Amino acid sequence: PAIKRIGNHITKSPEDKREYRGLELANGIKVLLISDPTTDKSSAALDVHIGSLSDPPNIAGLSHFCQHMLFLGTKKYPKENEYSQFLSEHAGSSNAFTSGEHTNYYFDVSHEHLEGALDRFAQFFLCPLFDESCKDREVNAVDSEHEKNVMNDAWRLFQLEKATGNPKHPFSKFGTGNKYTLETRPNQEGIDVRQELLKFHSAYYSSNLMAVCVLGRESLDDLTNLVVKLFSEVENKNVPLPEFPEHPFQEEHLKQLYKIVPIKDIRNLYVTFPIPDLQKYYKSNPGHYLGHLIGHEGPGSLLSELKSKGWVNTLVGGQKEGARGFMFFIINVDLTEEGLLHVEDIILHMFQYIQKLRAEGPQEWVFQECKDLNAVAFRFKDKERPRGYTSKIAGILHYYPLEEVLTAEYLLEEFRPDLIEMVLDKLRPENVRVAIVSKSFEGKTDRTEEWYGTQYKQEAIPDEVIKKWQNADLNGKFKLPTKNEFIPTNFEILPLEKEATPYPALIKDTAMSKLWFKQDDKFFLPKACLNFEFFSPFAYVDPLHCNMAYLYLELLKDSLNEYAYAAELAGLSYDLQNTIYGMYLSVKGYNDKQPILLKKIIEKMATFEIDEKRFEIIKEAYMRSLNNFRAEQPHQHAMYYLRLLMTEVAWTKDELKEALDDVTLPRLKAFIPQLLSRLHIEALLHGNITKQAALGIMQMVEDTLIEHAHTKPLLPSQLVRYREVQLPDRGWFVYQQRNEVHNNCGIEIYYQTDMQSTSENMFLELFCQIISEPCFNTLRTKEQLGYIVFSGPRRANGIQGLRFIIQSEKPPHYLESRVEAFLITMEKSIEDMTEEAFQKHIQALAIRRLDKPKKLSAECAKYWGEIISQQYNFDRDNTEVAYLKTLTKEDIIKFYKEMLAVDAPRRHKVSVHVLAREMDSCPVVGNLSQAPALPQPEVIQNMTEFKRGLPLFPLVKPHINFMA
């Protein structure tokens, strides 16, 4: 009765054991129920098909503001943090986002409390309070959220595009909103934002525009009754789905050139083509077909040629979402110094490639290759995490029939050459939009974008330029991709070996290498993870060598790109990056052809021949990259400085770029052989592989290095790890710096506890679990210090402690006092909490720590974490949780009194203050809860001096793991 329809069989992958049931409630809400008797966390998500695009013209950000307010209380549950508190006490988490056409809410929680969480959740769409007091506070959270984006190049460009299209089209709206648009201007215009929020929620949060997805251990029938009981009561206003048939870019918006001044020193070219909404053609995705070809990076591609000419390093092409009724097709690239001087030529090449596609006509074998690949990917798809899974499904239930939601955006069906020609016919000079981003335009622009202040200039593209592009002929350098040879064919799951182990086992332990191995015994998918850590002191010995290690690997990946792109498309991936201890290499994906790719990579790194041009280009990009860090957010700088202050050896960005200029091709070529001459390899091979195969891969890596690099074993005494600085009892240091880009402050407070150990770990983690929710509700919700308010444990070099991070317009010393006041409030709150509440927290942590991985890479990452930290505690979770359950409320109080309290005898505190741009100075020390009086801190003026004047902690001892 309350149900209008129960969908047929929900097409799923045969490897998927979860159960699905699709249905449509009488109110129009589309639902997808998911039963998983094994899930440790249950989850729900609801997506309302309306967003910022529906904001009233005079109240920018209203829909986003509504999203924030829905968390602050409902008639059934008044407490403004009843929702977040409930989830916190039950190992849950929640978040939501607002797009142009969607507002998505989601959460996860212990599988035992799905109903209680879902009940509180459903009230968001039934009886929101939109409390006046909450409204006046949370508006600051929205403003702060916008504030951090103001100096973000991505957002500036995002809003600039909107500002250059039809001013009458809702696409031009500012969706984030801020204090001005949500409070100041409305008050001046005599508008009641409270009413407007209610009016907005009332008019658009209709059941006919809602989709829900629930996942839990309960059966489909029980989940059906749960959902019907909590959502069938949502009212249906039969609201029409907003449509946007007229494209934001009309004739007068075409053949336009935009010159933009970025905040960071970046060089980019954006080419955009207005196109019809292609959503309904999803069965054949003509837009993705053209993106696949245009954005391809293999031999013969547009990228390959643009890179060879030394004009660009990266490229992305394909369709870009707009909204119901309109989309875009883009071709974006970064620019080298020379590329910036040849923009017209680059675009010409772009049209020559497009002309090549027209001349060859749609290629069915290409479509088929992707189709078969997507079929393989869907079949062996990794099991997703509940929260993200429900959120995603809730969103696509709006575009595909119930039975197709799982396969919709995965499987390709019919080849439609006619639709492809239709889209391709839109990629012409006469309907192109070009935007160039570069600091070279500074002082040369004449327009300012109102919301972000972006400096730019608009010009019509000369007809003679358009005409030359229209006459783009064929370029012999452009060819269609060749058949992908990395496509996997062997998907057999090797039978579990008789001596297989539940945790990684040390099957090789020599001076040259230490091999950890584990055959997958849970997922049974034709995939594997091959992780290799290459140790060498010459990777971080000094700034110069750090730069060379980076440059070397960056150049190696750049030369392997054409070759590796195909592998990537075939689900075979790899990551190679320099570390403070050497190099990191990870190959993941289908095990079938992993050996081929791995061998190629090792062979290449040991016989690598640097290309001078590529070298100069990448070095130049690296220099800007280091300099661009000055444009990062305050809290990012705070974390950066703390890291530099607390680690034994750490080269600063400034030291790195100062040494960069001395990096020459000759020196780099000499560097490589030296780096590979001596190494130690610690690996972790995990997945659909056998012990002998594992030993086989390791031997191949070694043999390749030995044969081409003459690599020899490193000395054990050379295998040095860095220590963390040891702070003195009752000590308090403050490091202060200014952020020259953002006009907001940032701060990080670090309360060092002690070396990591079962007891110390759980003391800290339990306490963090207990203060987690209260910290956010106090410093942000109540006090509204900023959008970014974070607390939690900090682990580094075997040491650990409590950390607080905040980004606010308020000065650091004031922020410091607030955090200190909060600590006093927590103390009191803990002494008064009931055993019932306390035990609830212990259980909350227990579930969080015991939540099991859903995919191979997640399980592997945990093992890798134990190997990298060199603690090798593979059964850590069971042990620590067992110990956790014995902690009492008294233990936590003592821990707080001896380590964290303001007058704690073993308090170890350091604070990093990052001042706002407009702040010339600021003290380091200074209704609302009462803040305690603090001591005079020692101001750090030189990081080197600071570290030198303090002792260093020892390194953690390895949890012995005996094996061959």
Binding site: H292, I330, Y787
Partner: peptide
């Protein structure tokens, strides 16, 4: 590579290094 709208969140859940 192939392209595969900036959207606003309620909270940042992990703080990160960057």
């Amino acid at each position: 590579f192939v392209n595969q709208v900036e959207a606003l969140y309620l909270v940042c859940g992990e703080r990160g290094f960057f």
